[PDB]
Structure formats: C-alpha cells, structure tokens
Amino acid sequence: LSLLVIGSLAFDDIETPFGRSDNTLGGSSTYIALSASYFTDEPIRMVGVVGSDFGKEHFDLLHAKNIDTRGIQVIEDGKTFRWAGRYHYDMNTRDTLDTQLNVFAEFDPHVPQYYRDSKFVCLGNIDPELQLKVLDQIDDPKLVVCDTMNFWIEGKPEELKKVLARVDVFIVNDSEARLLSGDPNLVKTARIIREMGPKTLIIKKGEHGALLFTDNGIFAAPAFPLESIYDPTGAGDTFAGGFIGHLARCGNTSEAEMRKAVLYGSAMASFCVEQFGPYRYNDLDLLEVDDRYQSFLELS
C-alpha cells in the first residue's frame, strides 16, 4: 500500500479579507502528504525539489508525520517555489498574484530506485511534463491519481492531455472543470473530461460538496453545513491526500471504497481550511478525523 507523492513544495503569501500569512509553508505535495499521512502505516514517499531557503523546521514538520523525504532534492543557492494568492468574501475563489517556479523550472524529477515500486501514485499539481516524467519511472502502479491547476490548463493544454490519458483518477474543482470543458453544466463537463482519458473524475466544488463520476454513476458528497473557513489554501490537495490515502490504506479500489474515499477527502479538507497554511495538522488527531468522517457519512 506504498504511496508516492509528487507536486510542489513551496512558500505562499496568502491574503484573505480578514488576514494574511506570508512565507507560509505550502505546495501541493505538502498538503497531499500531510493529509495522506493520517492513512498510511508506512512512510509516505516524496519526490520534489526545494531551495537552500527551505528551513529544517519544515523538514521536521514532514518527518513528524513520518513522511519520507529522501526523494526531495535541495538545490544549493536555488530558491524554493513561491506563490501569492488572494481570496475574497466568498472565501473560496482566489486570484493568483504571483507564481515563481524557481527550482521547479529546471527540475529533473528523478525517482530514486527505492521508490519505483510505489503502488499508489499521486501526481499532485505541478507542470504536466514533470507529472509525466515521474509516471514513466514507476514500474507497476495500482492507481494513479492526479490534479492540476488553471496555470497548466491554460499554459500547457496538450501536455496536460497527455498525462490525463494515463491517469485513473482526475481531481478538479468546479472552476477548473468548466475551464477544461468550455460548458458550465457539470454533468456534461464530466463527460467531456472523462473522454480525455480518466475513468474516474472528482469535481470538488470548494467546500460546498464533491461529485464523483464513474461508470457506475454519480455520487454527491454533501457539504458540511457550518464549516469554519479561514483559509481555503490547500483544501483541494488535502482532499486528494485523504482520498488516495484511504484507498492506499484499504488497498481496495472498488466503487464503494472510492465513495468512502471521497468522504475522507472531504473530512481532511474541512480541517485544512480552519487555519492559514497546513498548520491545523499540527495537533489534529485520529479521533477528530474519525468524527468528521462520520459527520460526512451521515450527511451522505
């Protein structure tokens, strides 16, 4: 039930109408790994790259969740990926103010030999060409999950479609989905997107619920009524982490398991949004996670 996580590792300058957090630890793989760690018994594997500015306090955070960082390269004198985002009163949508690929621009995604036998692969948000280069290095994956971002949907359409043709599960939010389909109807959008390759598609409408589209039909995961949203950053990636984490834990990829997996993902995302950055995970415990899952189950 080994799990390998790929994605960005970065520092974010986050702004909402109520407050801000600069130089915040972030990146899609950070959120995915921290969330998934609540499901695996063995160390989560990470492949990525950071600069010399990536302090050891950040490495200690990951190691505290028993995350294996041997696959993370540190570029001497290089700079860590940076991102700036701004939210508004709807506390869901956001503007990307700045994006500096930095070390990820010239990244050579080498997956160490001891990671090539990974069974569950999560191709987190990052350049589709890198996502593909990593996938090509995994010998026999049981399940490939992937998510992207408007940046790549608009910047590298063709490359993205190449990766979409080789993934089992594609996770997107409703904005990205409509951008990819060119039609506002989510049902038609799902069809258009699934025809690009992904057998399973999950459309997460912010913290307003998630839709699971498979050959067996549609599953609507309810929203948590009074969720306290303070910072949406990382929500979609923590969702992906709980989703693949659950599947990696039970090792079964059936329909029923994917539905429960969506519920776990929603539960993890509901905790993520409670504070700036990934810090709600500092003290979040299993009893709390189990309790939140039950709420979502009951609502579904």
Ligand X SMILES: Nc1ncnc2c1ncn2[C@@H]1O[C@H](COP(=O)(O)O)[C@@H](O)[C@H]1O
237 is an annotated ligand-binding site residue: yes
The helix (H) or strand (E) run that includes residue 18 is none
Alpha helices in 223-299 (DSSP H): 235-250, 255-272, 286-299
136: Cα separation from own chain's centroid:
20
- 3-state DSSP assignment of residue 127: coil
Nearer to a second copy, 31 or 38 (CB): 38
What whole-number distance in Å separates Cα of residue 135 and Cα of residue 115?
A: 11
Nearest residue to 71 (alpha-carbon basis) of 3, 140, 149: 3
Q: Is residue 294 a contact point for a second copy (CB under 8 A)?
A: yes
Q: After which residues is the chain broken (C to N over 2.5 A)?
A: none
Nearer to ligand X, 256 or 261 (CB): 261
Nearer to ligand X, 155 or 251 (CB): 155
Q: Is residue 39 a contact point for a second copy (CB under 8 A)?
A: yes
Nearer to a second copy, 43 or 78 (CB): 43
Q: Which of 23, 73, 99, 175 binds ligand X (CB under 6 A)?
A: 99
12 is an annotated ligand-binding site residue: yes
Exposure class string for 85-102: b at 16+ Cβ within 10 A, else e: bebeeebbebeeeebebb
147 is an annotated ligand-binding site residue: no
- Output the smallest distance, CB 55 to ligand X, in A: 16
152 is an annotated ligand-binding site residue: yes
Nearest residue to 239 (alpha-carbon basis) of 178, 165, 293, 185: 293
Nearer to ligand X, 1 or 90 (CB): 90
Residues 221-250 contacting a second copy, CB under 8 A: 249-250
Nearer to a second copy, 185 or 228 (CB): 228
DSSP string spanning 34-78? HHHTTT-SSPEEEEEEEETTS-HHHHHHHHHTTEEEEEEEEETT-
Residues 197-236 contacting ligand X, CB under 6 A: 233-236
Q: Which of 2, 16, 21, 28 binds ligand X (CB under 6 A)?
A: 28
Looking at beta carbons, which residue is closest to ligand X? Answer: 26
Range in contact with ligand X (rule: CB under 6 A) among 21-29, 115-123, 219-227, 282-290: 21-29
Nearest residue to 298 (alpha-carbon basis) of 233, 221, 202, 198: 221
What whole-number distance in Å separates Cα of residue 81 and Cα of residue 225?
A: 35
Nearer to ligand X, 54 or 83 (CB): 83
Q: Which of 288, 297, 299, 300 binds a second copy (CB under 8 A)?
A: 288
Range in contact with ligand X (rule: CB under 6 A) among 8-16, 66-74, 108-116, 130-138: 8-16
Residue type, 117: D
210-214 and 217-221: which strand pairing? antiparallel
Q: Is residue 8 a contact point for ligand X (CB under 6 A)?
A: yes
Q: Is the dihedral of CA 265, 253, 145, 62 positive or negative?
A: positive
Range in contact with ligand X (rule: CB under 6 A) among 23-31, 158-166, 190-198, 205-213: 23-31
* Binding annotation for AMP: 12, 27, 94, 152, 234, 237
Q: Which residues are at the interface with ligand X (CB under 6 A)? A: 8, 10, 12, 26-28, 31, 83, 99, 125-126, 149, 151, 233-237
